[PDB]
Design a protein around this nucleic acid. Sequence first.
RNA 1: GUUAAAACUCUUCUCAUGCUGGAUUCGAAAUUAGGUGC
Length: 224
Amino acid sequence: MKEIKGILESITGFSIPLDNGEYALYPAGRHLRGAIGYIAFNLDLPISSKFLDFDFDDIIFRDLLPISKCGKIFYPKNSNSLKCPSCNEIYGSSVLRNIMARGLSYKEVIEGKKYRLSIIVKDEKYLNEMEAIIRYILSYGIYLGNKVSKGYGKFKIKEYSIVDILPVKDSVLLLSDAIIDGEKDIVFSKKEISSSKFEIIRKRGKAKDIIRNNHNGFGFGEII
RNA sequence: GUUAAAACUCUUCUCAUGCUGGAUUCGAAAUUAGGUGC
């Protein structure tokens, strides 16, 4: 049970359009999965062959919450923002920046900031599978958010560290959105290359918050 | 294999107008068409 800890810098800005008009303040781990899925698809790996399944544990992509100036990690309930325990920074809406292109109205979060990579492999076969794509993305670049082909959302890894997992026991604070059948609306997709099938898979669950026993886990539902 | 994928912030618009390198200062200072032969 190892990890892939990483500081990723946005070279180009990124955009993820949640419902009713809201945009993601940070890139989610579902996008870090999806992009690595395309990457493995073109790298001919068994990770690629498995990425169709959502319940695929082993390799789990926690969301990419941002790093503060104090070398630590921002934490989010009822607070559409991010705060850190050093209490130095509030990362929020101000980072959105509305872009009016030709006929296109959308918003993105600006670049120049740093985000976490944390892929908790449990079996070492998929650790080697993950090492190869980490040594790929270090070479070229990963594309998170919409408009990947236009160039939006390039992240360069500055630090590829193969760290080790010490599990957690609590009954804890959700870093992302659990899927318990609570009240948070969580929407995502299952775009299927070599089937020409796209489906928007919608779910409900818990917001990003207070949470209590087994907790055999914890990339929508993450907690620490 | 990312609420994916697709869509260029594009078109139109001359750093242009006004203002003279002008003003001061003499090519002059020195030197016998001289020497020879009714």
